[PDB]
């Protein structure tokens, strides 16, 4: 049973904050993908540079599974060519993305009555992230012309701000768990294959 651990990426109890998005490399296994078959349990399901109906007969050098939590109106940014706080400062997909984006409403897991504040995102950054870059630093962001000396205040901001996931928010402000599969093809033997060309 060298079966690729895709289901464990989807059914994990804990998901990372988007600024520190988790990456699991999937290698040296037979790809299941059966979790993708139930489109009804997802709020968005889209692949890019590949059709989902071809995954079972394809081979790849590596599969990366990226996962994190964002709010509802921000899921549209997990796509090639998008902009916004998530796509600029937290998680950027390349224009030539090859993979799938999966998300579902996780209000029943990640929202608490007093509000869940454990999920963070980056509000500010001197420049956009390059595709698949991760930024977990917490230097004070200088928003104005006057430099900060590591001290917060006006125009001197802590760069990570917290979501407020309350079960009674509107769906655009409810938490969404996102999984991003990227399929990597190098000039090297494939280690992850669909069950129809194992």
């Amino acid at each position: 049973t060298n079966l690729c651990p895709f289901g464990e990426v989807f059914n994990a109890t804990r998901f990372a904050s988007v600024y520190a998005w988790n990456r699991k490399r999937i290698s040296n296994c037979v790809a299941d993908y059966s979790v993708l078959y139930n489109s009804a349990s997802f709020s968005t399901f889209k692949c890019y540079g590949v059709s989902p109906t071809k995954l079972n007969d394809l081979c790849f050098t590596n599969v990366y599974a990226d996962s994190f939590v964002i709010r509802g109106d921000e899921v549209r940014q997990i796509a090639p060519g998008q902009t916004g706080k998530i796509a600029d400062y937290n998680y950027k997909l390349p224009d030539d993305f090859t993979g799938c984006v999966i998300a579902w409403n996780s209000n029943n897991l990640d929202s608490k009555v007093g509000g869940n504040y454990n999920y963070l995102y980056r509000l500010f950054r001197k420049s956009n992230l390059k595709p698949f870059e991760r930024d977990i630093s917490t230097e004070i962001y200088q928003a104005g012309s006057t430099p900060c000396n590591g001290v917060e205040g006006f125009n001197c901001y802590f760069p990570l701000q917290s979501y407020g996931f309350q079960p009674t928010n509107g769906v655009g402000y409810q938490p969404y768990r996102v999984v991003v599969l990227s399929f990597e093809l190098l000039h090297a033997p494939a280690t992850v294959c669909g069950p129809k060309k194992s």
Partner: antibody
Amino acid sequence: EVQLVESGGGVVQPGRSLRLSCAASGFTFSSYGMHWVRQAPGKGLEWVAVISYDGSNKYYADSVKGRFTISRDNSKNTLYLQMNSLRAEDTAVYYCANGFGEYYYYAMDVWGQGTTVTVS
Amino acid sequence: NFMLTQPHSVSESPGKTVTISCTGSSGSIASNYVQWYQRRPGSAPTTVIYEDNQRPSGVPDRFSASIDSSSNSASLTISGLKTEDEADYYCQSYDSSNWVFGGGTKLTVL
């Protein structure tokens, strides 16, 4: 040659029950999801239900939620739609369709030629 | 629930191009894959577009589709109109546990 031939009832009394059958040929039936879609005379297309290749996932349109019941038998290559408590607004040509690609069923691929169910 | 709304009718002259719109409501059209189905008078439906803008083998390149998240709409476009294109056109997708069809647009080739 992927073929879907629905067979089943025509004229039935309101409040009765009827069993639709869909015979699939020309593809590995067990590895595809299947949809039921109807088209009442004059009206447009309307989805009834869908069943996964396993039978483990079943979903229904709200307007048929309790009465209708989808099922399949992969040994007989047959899709079934059990509709009890038939009402008159369910009068339509009933199409049976397979999902695009194996397993996935977010889309329909080949459609059948339908059976016309008249409730009166 | 998530809804797909098409115009009731549309019509153009042979050789011209027409465009059928499919605008979602109570949900985003760009979230999930959008399909286009063609049902000729009396016939069974056939598939013409899948996964937003793909053509199955056999569908002429006169058929094209796209998404517009600004307007929350999908758009089928048929070029070089021919009388064989006269049909009802239904867009389709799904929101969670519900698969949705647009009301359907009858296309008349003048």
